[PDB]
């Protein structure tokens, strides 16, 4: 059962694909599962049993790329982006089924089109993984199989040891991850200063602050560090940029909890079963929520700059919900 699938590009997104590998291992036999995404989300995947290959990535590219898929006789393919072009490559690939939403009018490239009822698929994660059954025998979440297989990622001690080392990191004292920065823009970020009045609060009470992100994310980075006084800034890290998602996955998994926003990282932090506190504002997690029983979501309101409604969310309020939680650990 030679499988092969066409990625997201987001980190969010390529997380909670895992559930349809997952799936598709649970009912089909022997099921080897290729995933073709973009350079920088091999790391990731590489950290997923689930998938046996990263096919590593225009028209006239396109079509080269396909034809050289030809060889591996892939027996299906599921498109998990939206876009049109997005389901070429399994086409020229020549592979005989072909299944995905409709998105972009795909009802050419795709053989076996799903119609999408958003009301009866409210969640993401139900989403892809409805992909790995048959077209006429799902109509809402509801009949989907239960359990459902959410996102899962294992990290073993050694791996998260060698890993703190590498990044320079004192197992002098437990750590707590951040992750300041947000996909879908500075409205969905806790404000800088409110990490930052976070991150002292913490480093007083004994832990040691890492903020996690992309290169972009550096810089909300450093604006945090340089609000903490030299005592503190010797027990906050800036990693945004300095690690590839599997060092970051490792990291995360070895911290005792992590605060972050409505984004991707949040997602990966939930499948390493972390405590985790996600803060949210003007986005709800109505439809991408973090899988995981130890998170909790705080949002004060219901439906360039910052959202008043993040900047309401109180340091204090989240170190209460934070310390919480760090405790249920312990005991």
Known sequence: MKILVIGPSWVGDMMMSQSLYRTLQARYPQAIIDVMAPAWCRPLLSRM??????????????????????????????????????????????????????????????????????????????????????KGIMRTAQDLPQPLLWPQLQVSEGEKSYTCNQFSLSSE????????????????????????????????????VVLFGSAKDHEAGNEILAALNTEQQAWCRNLAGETQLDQAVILIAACKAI??????????????????????????????????????????????????????????????????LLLQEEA
């Open 173 to 208: 004292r437990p750590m707590i991850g951040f992750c300041p920065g947000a996909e879908f823009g500075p409205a969905k970020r806790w404000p800088h200063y409110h990490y930052a009045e976070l991150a002292k609060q913490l480093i007083d009470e004994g832990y040691q």
């Open 49 to 134: 049993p689930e998938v046996n290959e990263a096919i590593p990535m225009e028209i006239g590219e396109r079509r080269k790329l396909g034809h050289s898929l030809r060889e591996k006789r892939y027996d299906r393919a599921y498109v998990l982006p939206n876009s049109f072009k997005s389901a070429l490559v399994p086409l020229f690939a020549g592979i005989p089924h072909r299944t995905g939403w409709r998105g972009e009018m795909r009802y050419g490239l795709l053989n076996d089109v799903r119609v999408l009822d958003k009301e009866a698929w409210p969640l993401m994660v139900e989403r892809y993984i409805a992909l790995a059954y048959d």
């Open 259 to 324: 605060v972050t926003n409505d984004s991707g990282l949040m997602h990966v932090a939930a499948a390493l079963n972390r405590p985790l506190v996600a803060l949210y504002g003007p986005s709800s997690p109505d439809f991408t929520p973090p899988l995981s029983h130890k998170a909790r979501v705080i949002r004060l309101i219901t439906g360039e700059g910052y959202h008043q409604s993040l900047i309401d969310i109180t340091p204090q309020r989240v170190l209460e919900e934070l310390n919480a």
